[PDB]
Design a protein around this ligand. Structure first.
Ligand SMILES: CCO/N=C/c1ccc(OCC[C@@H](C)CCN2CCN(c3ccnc(N)c3)C2=O)cc1
Ligand SMILES: CCO/N=C/c1ccc(OCC[C@@H](C)CCN2CCN(c3ccnc(N)c3)C2=O)cc1
Ligand code: NA
Ligand code: NA
Ligand code: NA
Ligand code: NA
Lengths: 58, 245, 242, 297, 58, 242, 49, 99, 49, 48
């Protein structure tokens, strides 16, 4: 399908597998999203990363 | 050479000279839970010889009028030896069983017992007779412990199902003119990899006379039926304090 | 839009239609399936398992129900007496209803195959005897004597170490399949009769019981199949199940 | 590391369950081979030992003289899907105007298919079953008349708020799946996945759901397995004022992608309750028909 | 079709031939099942298998 | 036209149906997406972030609400006294409701995984002490004493430079997933209990406070997942929101 | 709204508009409105002959 | 105090067995969580009334009037998405009329 | 859904229409066909008698 | 029931007239001195 690139996720770090019958891509289905995750961005945003075994403050 | 047999496991050995082969339920042997079927993360404990051995739990008397009995597993063992202790101290348990029901007589006695294993043997009540009362079986009837419990209506196995079709479950018959015991090996049966040895009874052992015991006056009238059983591949996890129920 | 035209059948809900329906929980994944013993793949697997045939389907009071699971034999007078009879029709009212084969049979309109009934003697070890078990194909009336029954398919059973014997009721039909037989025109599909006779006599020495019982177990042969799925004749509920 | 011999040579930990049997393809009934008269000593196919627990291995060929028969009768209609993938009634929901039951224009039905004997007796042939299912909802008035009414069906999984009224905030259905449909439209129909926390649903659970003393008052919990309790199905007429018509919703289920384990004896006494196998003790009836004598048809 | 593997029979010893128009496989038809059978699991679960011709107890 | 036939489901509006709908603004192009920090891809990402667990969920008056965020420890009499207890069930009414894990949990019917609670001591630097934190798997009643609690999974915490300690509540369940637990039959899914005991004693020299508090932070382990999307038990609105 | 049900020989014939047999758990049934087009299905060759 | 969450795992706190975990993380993606239609607006067109008795109505597009949906979206500060809107109409009794 | 448009003829039942209709008994297999003498293939065969 | 918890054999009468009970060596010491009442009961083998 040679359609328009007007989806909210055009140029995303996660590729989708969708269905559509119209010239506008936002009309497409939600499809499947990529299963990538990055917990550290929230659970461990430290500058100098500390190991598990060690004592966090040395 | 199929009539004779020796069962050795742990520090216990059983012999029989009038056997009728051995049944391996649903065609498969007991085994430990694999790493992909498992879900619980703690490293299990597998006591081996101290719990996988034969325990002789009870003896019943077969009489011309006996209706039949049943026992629940692992209920019969939850208070016996080292197996019982592990079952009490742990939340999770799993194992198989080797069941050996013994009953001998003379070449002049007659009768046939049906020995069968029925998974998830839920007991029902007669519903106040008229069927308008939603009564329920008491704890001592659903989990009778080692003494077992006597069937009130064997024809429907106290659960609204025909005993005539019980043979669709792993079984053997003890027909006095032929053999003096039944031996059935049962693998772990459940929809989960481990479960509570206390709250859940995986299967029931049914011993029911289908052809009544008979003999002439003068022959030994006391004909016992003894129940011996061994856990196989016992595994336990989820350790904490002992709990009886 | 693309040109379409609705045909008859539109909007109907056919209970056996095998179609596609929208999924309520998108991206849902079921709990994985662990190994569980005893998986069955085809009902035919269960039909080859012997269950008890209530040949002695006469007692009806609660306290005597168990007596239907077995029938007796005992010392006679050597006149080739009749021990018992029953129709071989598996999907017909009678003894076969007690078996799992008979019950599964109820969920199918037609069946085809050989059947087998294994008889197990449960008398004392000291008891001996020879029985003649006969199968009479359609058309033959209930045999008046052993001499008449003997003319059909039969087995002569000798009591001994092997407690049991198997009577095979071979598939002998005019049609490839039989529908469930019953009184009336559908008797066209009857399988026939089975009769048990004393070939010699039940013999026993001083000290052993004069009466013993036989338990009958039945199932289907490996050439047995069923077709045309239907509802069973029974509906086990009176009012609403609460 | 390991060093004592009994440890090195033990089988503790073997997860490979050895199997004594294996499946074979069997698309048709077995054929019959030519057989002739046999007059042997030692060979005795007709004699069995039922005590062993196995079924007879005797075949037509060894009991009578047979001809050759090429059997092409199919075994296809006896597969689990063939037997179960036929939609049957499993639920009925009433939404009357004048009434004692649900006169408020809404209703909550606990998802439990054991209230109808036909379907129930089929599934209870097995102890464990894993399957997906297609549900169809047929709605009309109690006369079977079709009226211009809009309904809302909503699946409320365990833990989600059950509507307590036709105007409950729960009908906003922001996460629960809902279906909006008219009685004038064809029957609504959706696919449901296998949702249990267990690997299979089980029609029998010989145990209790919790620990503790199992005294008389709690014995109604014997046999209760939460792994089988999938939630609530809620229905309402879509409006702030009472509907003008009395309605009925019949629920049909068609299982698909079925697997089943542990066959068992089939029910032979009438069912009384959904939650248990209780039978009427004063009416224990024989599994089937009876006759006057064992020597007479 | 590149869909999700959410059918009740994903990873079964019997392969199915089904139709589907959705991203979730459980929405698929029942199709045809494999015709494999194993009667012995129920009709003959004996440890030491005995022949037809022989005497079952010797 | 091309022959079609409408099937059941026709015209229905299923809220979770993932279909195609006509676009209202043809040839429209959205404002490009610039880079924005903190993009989240999966809710599981948020479940691994510790939020404050209100172990001390007892005060209820507005002015004392903040007191629920911490619980106390102080000098005792060396009899291994009990400091506090709480259920480990994350999706159950109780302390876990204060955490983001607990709240997200509310949007799912089933969960599976190990949990972790990190306890941070906020007493003075001169305060020392050793606590025993125990996790009791299902079936075990609330431990009457430290000797009983000690029989289950536990950690012995020693106050020092490292202000905090982590108690891992490992996944020990009979089923692969648990549904939200509550009183009644659903207690089948309870996770268990957590109890905090004095291993030795809270010790402090002259000049330092005799009472200090501990803050509890909780989150899920990396093997934690959730399934069967559902609506949360709460609806934060009374009348219409204007 | 009507219900058509095929009852093969041996299956219980409904004896009333409210017969338990209409649960149609195995028999094939068709539910349709008179307002819908004529219902239509395919039937195989079902004889034993 | 550092601001990071604990890095301690089951393996280091107790003796564990091996577990091959195949539980999916698919249902917790943003689309899985949000792509479920919920109520966000209600418009009344009564005959006799105080509100819109003139046969027309103007609704400002604002989905914050319903708590279920609102509480889900407010978990995030910024969101970019396309949307499918569905309009269900009937009388206040849920009756379907030829209008 | 996929854009369609109904044309005249919709819903009609033409008795000679050769179409496809849902099958009532899935996975059903008919009794095999044995050999039977005298099969006719075309009515024209009978017209020459 | 209590005796059954230790080492045992279940004997079935039949053609083989005899059965053997093995009293395995289960001792704390490599050798035992003759046991008797008193402190030397330390060396007792057990009961049958
Ligand atoms: C708009 C949204 O439309 N949603 C439709 C919809 C339909 C069905 C549904 O879930 C269907 C659940 C059934 C497939 C299985 C029912 N089961 C399992 C075993 N079980 C048992 C086991 C043991 N004892 C008793 N009593 C009962 C039982 O009853 C959810 C949602
Ligand atoms: C025939 C033509 O059919 N046309 C249909 C149709 C449907 C929807 C539509 O536009 C939908 C807009 C929504 C997708 C987003 C609404 N949003 C954005 C964030 N926001 C906020 C943010 C902060 N505070 C408040 N209060 C609200 C908010 O409410 C236009 C046209
Ligand atoms: Na349990
Ligand atoms: Na559909
Ligand atoms: Na659309
Ligand atoms: Na058609």
């Amino acid at each position: 399908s040679h359609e328009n690139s007007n989806s909210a996720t055009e140029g995303s770090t996660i590729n989708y597998t969708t269905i559509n019958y119209y010239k506008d891509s936002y009309a497409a289905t939600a499809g499947k999203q990529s299963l990538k995750q990055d917990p550290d961005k929230f659970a461990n945003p430290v500058k100098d990363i500390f190991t598990e075994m060690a004592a966090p403050l040395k | 050479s199929d009539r004779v047999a020796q069962l050795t496991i742990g520090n216990s050995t059983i012999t029989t000279q009038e056997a009728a082969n051995i049944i391996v339920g649903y065609g498969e042997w007991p085994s430990y839970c694999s790493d992909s079927d498992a879900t619980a993360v703690d490293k299990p404990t597998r006591p081996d010889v101290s719990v996988n051995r034969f325990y002789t739990l009870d003896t019943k008397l077969w009489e011309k009028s006996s209706k039949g009995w049943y026992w629940k597993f692992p209920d019969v063992l939850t208070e016996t030896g080292v197996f019982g202790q592990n079952a009490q101290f742990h939340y999770l348990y799993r194992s198989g069983f080797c069941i050996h029901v013994q009953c001998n007589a003379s070449k002049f006695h007659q009768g046939a017992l049906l020995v069968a294993v029925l998974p998830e043997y839920v007991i029902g009540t007669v519903a106040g007779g008229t069927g308008t009362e939603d009564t329920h079986p008491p704890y001592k009837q659903t989990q009778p412990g080692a003494d077992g419990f006597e069937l009130q209506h064997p024809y429907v196995l106290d659960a609204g199902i025909p005993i005539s079709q019980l043979t669709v479950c792993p079984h053997q018959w003890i027909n006095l003119r032929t053999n003096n015991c039944a031996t059935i090996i049962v693998p772990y049966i459940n929809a989960l990899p481990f479960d509570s040895a206390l709250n859940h009874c995986n299967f029931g052992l049914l011993v029911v006379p289908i052809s009544p015991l008979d003999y002439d006056q003068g022959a030994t009238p006391v004909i016992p039926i003894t129940i011996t059983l061994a856990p196989m591949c016992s595994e336990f996890a989820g350790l904490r304090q002992a709990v009886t129920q | 839009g693309f040109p379409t035209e609705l045909k008859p059948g539109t909007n109907q809900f056919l209970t056996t239609d095998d179609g596609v329906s929208a999924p309520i929980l998108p991206n849902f994944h079921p709990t994985p399936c662990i190994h569980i013993p005893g998986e069955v793949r085809n009902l035919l697997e269960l039909c080859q398992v012997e269950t008890i045939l209530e040949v002695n389907n006469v007692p009806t009071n609660a306290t005597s129900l168990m007596e239907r699971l077995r029938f007796p034999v005992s010392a006679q007078a050597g006149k080739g007496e009749l021990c018992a009879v029953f129709r071989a029709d598996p999907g017909r009212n009678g003894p076969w209803q007690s078996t799992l084969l008979g019950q599964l049979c109820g969920y199918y309109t037609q069946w085809s195959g050989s059947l087998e009934v294994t008889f197990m003697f449960t008398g004392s070890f000291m008891a001996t005897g020879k029985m003649l078990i006969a199968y009479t194909p359609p058309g033959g009336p209930l045999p008046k004597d052993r001499a008449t029954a003997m003319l059909g398919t039969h087995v002569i059973w000798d009591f001994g170490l092997q407690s049991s014997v198997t009577l095979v009721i071979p598939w002998i039909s005019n049609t490839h399949y039989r529908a469930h037989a019953r009184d009336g025109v559908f008797d066209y599909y009857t399988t026939g009769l089975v009769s048990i006779w004393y070939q010699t006599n039940y013999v026993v020495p001083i000290g052993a019981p004069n009466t013993a019982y036989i338990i009958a177990l039945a199932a289907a042969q490996k050439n047995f199949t069923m077709k045309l799925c239907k509802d069973a004749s029974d509906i086990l509920q009176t009012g609403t199940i609460q | 590391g390991d060093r004592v011999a009994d440890v090195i040579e033990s089988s503790i930990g073997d997860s490979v369950s050895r199997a004594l049997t294996h499946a074979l393809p069997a698309p048709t009934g077995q054929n019959t081979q030519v057989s002739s008269h046999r007059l042997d000593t030692g060979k005795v196919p007709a004699l069995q030992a039922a005590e062993i627990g196995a079924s007879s291995n005797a075949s037509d060929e060894s009991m009578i003289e047979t001809r050759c028969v090429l059997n092409s009768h199919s075994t296809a209609e006896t597969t689990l899907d063939s037997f179960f993938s036929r939609a049957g009634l499993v639920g009925e929901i009433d939404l009357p105007l004048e009434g004692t039951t649900n006169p408020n224009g809404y209703a909550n039905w606990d998802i439990d298919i054991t209230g109808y004997a036909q379907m129930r007796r089929k599934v209870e042939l097995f102890t464990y079953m894993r399957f997906d299912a297609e549900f169809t909802f047929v709605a009309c008035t109690p006369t079977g008349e079709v009226v211009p009414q809009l309904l809302q069906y909503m699946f409320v999984p365990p833990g989600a708020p059950k509507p307590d009224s036709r105007e409950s905030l729960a009908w906003q259905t922001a996460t629960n799946p809902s279906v909006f449909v008219k009685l004038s439209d064809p029957p609504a129909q959706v696919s449901v996945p296998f949702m249990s926390p267990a690997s299979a649903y089980q029609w029998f659970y010989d145990g209790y759901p919790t620990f503790g003393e199992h005294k008389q008052e709690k014995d109604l919990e014997y046999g209760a397995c939460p792994n089988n309790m999938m939630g609530t199905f809620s229905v309402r007429t879509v409006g702030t004022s009472k509907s003008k018509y009395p309605l009925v919703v019949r629920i049909y289920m068609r299982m698909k992608h079925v697997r089943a384990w542990i066959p068992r004896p089939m029910r032979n006494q009438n069912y009384l309750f959904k939650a248990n196998p209780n039978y009427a003790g004063n009416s224990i009836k024989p599994t089937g028909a009876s006759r006057t004598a064992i020597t007479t048809l």
